[PDB]
Amino acid sequence: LTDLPGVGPSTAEKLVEAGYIDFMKIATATVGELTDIEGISEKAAAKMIMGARDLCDLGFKSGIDLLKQRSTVWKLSTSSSELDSVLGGGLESQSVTEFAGVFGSGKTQIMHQSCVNLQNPEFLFYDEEAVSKGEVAQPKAVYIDTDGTFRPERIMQMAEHAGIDGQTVLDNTFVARAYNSDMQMLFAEKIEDLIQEGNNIKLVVIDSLTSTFRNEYTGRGKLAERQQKLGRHMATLNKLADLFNCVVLVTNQVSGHAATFRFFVRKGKGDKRVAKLYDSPHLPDAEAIFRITEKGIQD
Ligand SMILES: Nc1ncnc2c1ncn2[C@@H]1O[C@H](COP(=O)(O)OP(=O)(O)O)[C@@H](O)[C@H]1O
Ligand SMILES: [Mg+2]
Ligand SMILES: [Mg+2]
């Protein structure tokens, strides 16, 4: 951090204790966040931010550089050919993908499958030129279980059929049981701490995203506070996805959020499930047929 203009050893310590350890978090921080660090003037705050931006080469980009920026996005397979195809390759890092649908449609299943697939190196599609092995090495997932439906057995089972060690998935998956939106949001924010602790978080799951909010802000007369809180939460999830180049997944029970990809999943005949991609920035609306068996997501 002392590389940063105006940042000496003493300021560097105040910065590390305030959570600001890497350049990107400073380069993208507001003069407000830092000035609040106390002992950090607004002058020093603006200088180090300007400095960090330069160090991280933030600025106008054009031509081939646009393709290169886009290439830093890696993708996680869902184990369903149909789905991956409709996703334009697989779940995208640096973005939030939402799977909404009726109870039993398979939302939680997809969440578990993703935690497993993260441990299958061949399931992470990326341009070796924009993303180095080390960046996706020893990947870890964080699962914010809001409904209390995380099932280690299911992880073990899906892993087995994938030919990978189930215990290895468990060892690399942090689960956080949230009983309300406050815990849910806080846990989400604490993810930076796990990364700071050396954990290569590459997959974040929020299952579910809206349950707590709906239960807490049932009154549609105070739908204001709710739509707000949820917005801040989503903003936090999106920033996480970008800064730490990781895949963020959230589920929504349904009988509009800031998710960059939005799916509506419905039950087909028996095993069959239909995932309808209805919102994305560059892909056409399309349906993917897959199934849910003892092996997890397949087809
Ligand atoms: N071990 C399993 N083997 C085959 N299918 C399973 C297994 N576990 C769960 N399922 C399927 O998952 C469905 C429920 O998926 P779930 O993700 O919990 O729904 P939701 O969308 O509400 O989260 C079940 O009704 C069952 O068909
Ligand atoms: Mg993004
Ligand atoms: Mg569920």
UniProtKB/Swiss-Prot annotation:
ATP binds at G101, V102, F103, G104, S105, G106, K107, T108. Keywords: ATP-binding, DNA damage, DNA recombination, DNA-binding, Nucleotide-binding. PROSITE patterns: RECA_2, RECA_3. GO terms for molecular function: ATP binding; ATP hydrolysis activity; ATP-dependent DNA damage sensor activity; damaged DNA binding; identical protein binding. GO terms for biological process: DNA recombination; DNA repair. SMART domains: AAA, HhH1. It comes from the Archaea. It holds the Pfam family HHH_5. PANTHER family: MEIOTIC RECOMBINATION PROTEIN DMC1_LIM15 HOMOLOG, RECA/RAD51/RADA DNA STRAND-PAIRING FAMILY MEMBER. Belongs to the eukaryotic RecA-like protein family. Involved in DNA repair and in homologous recombination. Binds and assemble on single-stranded DNA to form a nucleoprotein filament. Hydrolyzes ATP in a ssDNA-dependent manner and promotes DNA strand exchange between homologous DNA molecules. This is DNA repair and recombination protein RadA. It comes from Methanococcus voltae.
